[PDB]
């Protein structure tokens, strides 16, 4: 699809917000979550999700599905940099290793297993 944030304003915003977030919440990682177009799942608002570096991918994933209230009838899958992250990996580790030029993380979700 494309990055809505990157189209509108990212570099300046991400720089200032990263400084504020690192200063106030040094133990948290700044993530952006978007709904992949075409799947049957509910849509997501434009929000800046700040998760503690202590939790694992398993907990973060479970929170995204619980927040959007994913029923047992549908499935939910996550994607980061075109890869399937390991649920047991730590938020801080995945953040530091995948740390972008703007020091933020981009995660997309789908409610289908085959995106085509």
């Amino acid at each position: 699809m494309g990055w809505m944030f990157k189209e509108d304003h990212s570099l300046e915003h991400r720089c200032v917000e990263s400084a504020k977030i690192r200063a106030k919440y040094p133990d948290r990682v700044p993530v952006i979550v978007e709904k992949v177009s075409g799947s049957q799942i509910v849509d997501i608002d434009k929000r800046k999700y700040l998760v503690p570096s202590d939790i694992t991918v398993a907990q973060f994933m479970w929170i995204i599905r619980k927040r959007i209230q994913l029923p047992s009838e549908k499935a939910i899958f996550l994607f980061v940099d075109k890869t399937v992250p390991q649920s047991s990996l730590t938020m801080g580790q995945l953040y530091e290793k995948e740390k972008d030029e703007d020091g933020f993380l981009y995660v997309a979700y789908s409610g289908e297993n085959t995106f085509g």
């Binding site: 944030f5 917000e17 919440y25 929000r47 999700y49 700040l50 929170i63």
Partner: peptide
């Protein structure tokens, strides 16, 4: 520098999440 225009299209509200 802080081009925080009053015309923001995409909101991007901060949300601290943990569980």
């Amino acid at each position: 520098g802080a081009m925080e225009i009053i015309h923001e299209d995409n909101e991007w509200g901060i949300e601290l999440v943990s569980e």
